[model samples]
Target: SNPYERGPDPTESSVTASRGPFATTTDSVSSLVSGFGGGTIYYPTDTSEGTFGGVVIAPGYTATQSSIAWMGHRIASQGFVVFTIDTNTRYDQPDSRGRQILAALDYLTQQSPVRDRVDPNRLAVMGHCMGGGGTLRAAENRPSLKAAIPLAPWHLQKDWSNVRVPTMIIGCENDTVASVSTHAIRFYESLPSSLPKAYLELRGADHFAPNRPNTTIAKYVIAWLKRFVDEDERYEQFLCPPPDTGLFSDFSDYRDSCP
Candidate 1:
């Protein structure tokens, strides 16, 4: 059985609300297969325990590794291994970018510094804009992925419901490039109801809201990863709760039905 499968009552757990353990650092590495050199790795400064969840992040079209650096550092600090990668070509399509995300995982699981540190079963993918769209494609193609988070994702147009991975689709309400109505909303609605999913729309955010540091996004990302990717019941308190009386000021819309 998949140990990561959802429990009967996610909200019934006793987990507290807190940031995960570990400080983070960044470094560049090469993918031996492609000889590409723009891969950025973020990991807990201390991993003597020898096991941590893993995540791969991809930037939007024409964007570089620096574009999603914040996500790498933030997620890594919470005890997971993160890789922020540059696509082989700036003009590469979403599918190609998806391949790169998976390739980064292949490298992380096989290389030094992070080779034996990552738990192969606890893994996720995240991206911004086109990279976000690619994240979906990657998760869809790799059903074993634990979770997927797409930040204001942009996809030209295609049937995306084959995505069965637990997913959180974060949208920028005011984004003009990938309008929430057209891209994020459409994609979220396409996901099968059987899968665990959530749609969060940041109030008045633009296409680049995810690039900068935001406490709200960081909180949600960490909690989602912990609950689903790490398979920890402790995070259930944050993932599901009684209706809030305007507690979250950052998100204009939030719908979570995760198990």
Candidate 2:
């Protein structure tokens, strides 16, 4: 169970759906040049036109391959070409953090044996907490990234000038690890106004609630990613879920950093 006890009971929600065929494989990121990490790429199915939009997932601080493994599997099952990266970015080492993500992108788009099956142009990046911050940083390097979703993300040294792509910041009312008021909102505002941008404040969810799959929070993310990244209108309703209609009681607080 999510320690923060967010949203409705996962079992009761209609959004939390079933899984698809699984895909996993290990790749050595020799270009990383520091701190070893390896992970499998999970695909819901081998079908050529993947629903995932070729996204790369980066987990929050102290989160590992196991803590968020279910999400990776679930995303792949949802028809995505998903790559769940291993967490080992030495915070002090800037180049290493950027390289690990870039290397993974290169694998999926250029190096990975399955590259031809995945759409290189429809790529996106996502993460939680500090890793959310890292996702933005990683996107800065890759101009081809279609969209970016940072859940409860903080700024990298409070700097937002490098972010030039479309982004979404998911903030939680109960987040204390990274102040939603100071970090998430600030980053949203700092992004270029010309880009397609939006910020959503989850009324009752917490940071860890979305990390696991098969929850109301998870369903919302799957739909949100589909609409923005995959451009699927069917998932649009999850964008601003009705407060009373869902598990959340009401909108507690929200503000836009966007123009």
Candidate 3:
């Protein structure tokens, strides 16, 4: 029972659905890297503003790029370049998935004019279920990453103290596949307290909320990326001063801290 009083629920609608005002495009590219399939790239048709940040994502085990394409479209629409990739196989483990994500980032930076529009310094990783865990794995190994977002992540290992990147771990309260207590929450707890981290538990959602039309989650994801990856100070309002009042009933619980 939250003692915080009520307010208009901010997360009632999908915050990241409008595809923004910027024009966007999508294309598939073959991977030049060994041991992985290529990925689909989502980018803004106009990059006159500046070099946009980039994100590389992997889908859950036994899932394909199409399973997580919505994230690519939404994040790309918001001015960041998105890469939703296929693994070498449907059931690749977390470590392999992490490497595949980095490889796609490599292909994104090295090929064609993509390098011109994408800032290599500003990058993030994201995923669902196993892919979510892979995102953490990737960020742990790649300290150069600016941010990491994991959606209802499932991992065999519990220790994530090595992850130094700013991270947001979203857990589904009703997720039987990757129980919040054992997976998302455990992973969040493993992170160093000094590192910027947030844990948000979806009230009634199953494991697939991140892939669907939940704008509240999108709001934070976009804000986290903007604040950390893009280094934009304007997103501070969303990141800091966690709500003191009862907000979204759709959110069962949330805790956050920022440096």
Candidate 4:
């Protein structure tokens, strides 16, 4: 992934391998592989207690290294062992996009920073645009991923009923690239209730809600993390907030949810 490249490059960025503090190539749950289809492990500066739960962020179409930095940094700052991945779907790339997500989960459970700190029993997957579809595919491919959030997702190939984990689908009304009424609603209704499920509709907002400045995507992301990952009931209200409330209306959003 091009850490500095921005504006979304569909093809895997010219990746040059360099070892960081967390750069020991080790695979526990799954084997270590190559390409944007796979990702490396990141050991936090402070891992006294050992590994904690992890988050796998799959990037969307034309996604560059610059795309998900903010969200990745934010989630990592929250004490998670997070992986910002470039799935194989982009640029006619053939990657173990689905397998890598599981490999990351396995790596997190076995890695030092997250091994003990994170509950391998609970893992989360997240993505945007085409990555959204990849996220769902990851969850569908691996039940080990406890929860997932598909942001303005698209390319719904599987049945929503196949989603058996707690999922939060956030969509924007004005997004032409990914239609809310077409994909969002159908996906929401198909999710199985045996696990928790939610759908947030942001009106007037476009495809880039998460990237939008001053947007409420952070709040919702945090809320979802707190609820499913942290099991914090206080954040539950954000799941199904009043129609006119939340940061949406104030921020020109038309968003709704199902929990």
TM-score of each: 0.87, 0.74, 0.89, 0.71
lDDT of 1 by residue, 1-259 (tens): 3444322333322122233456667677854446233578888767565578889999998888888887776677667889888888777777788888888887888764667778887899999999999999999999999999999999986467899999999999899999999999999998998888889888888999999987777777877888788787666677677124253667778877744
lDDT winner between candidates 1 and 2 = 1
Model 2 TM-score (2 dp): 0.74
Give the per-residue lDDT digits (tens) of candidate 2, residues 187-234.
787777666666767776676755655354466566656655666655
Weakest lDDT window of 10 consecutive positions for candidate 2: 1-10
lDDT of 3 by residue, 151-199 (tens): 8899998999999999999899899999999999999999998999999
TM-score of 3: 0.89
lDDT of 1 at 209: 98
The model with the greatest lDDT is 3
* Best model per TM-score: 3
The local distance difference test score of model 4 is 0.59
Provide the lowest-lDDT 10-residue window in model 1. Answer: 10-19
TM-score of 4: 0.71
By TM-score, the better pick of 3 and 4 is 3
Error of model 3, residue 190, in angstroms: 1.1
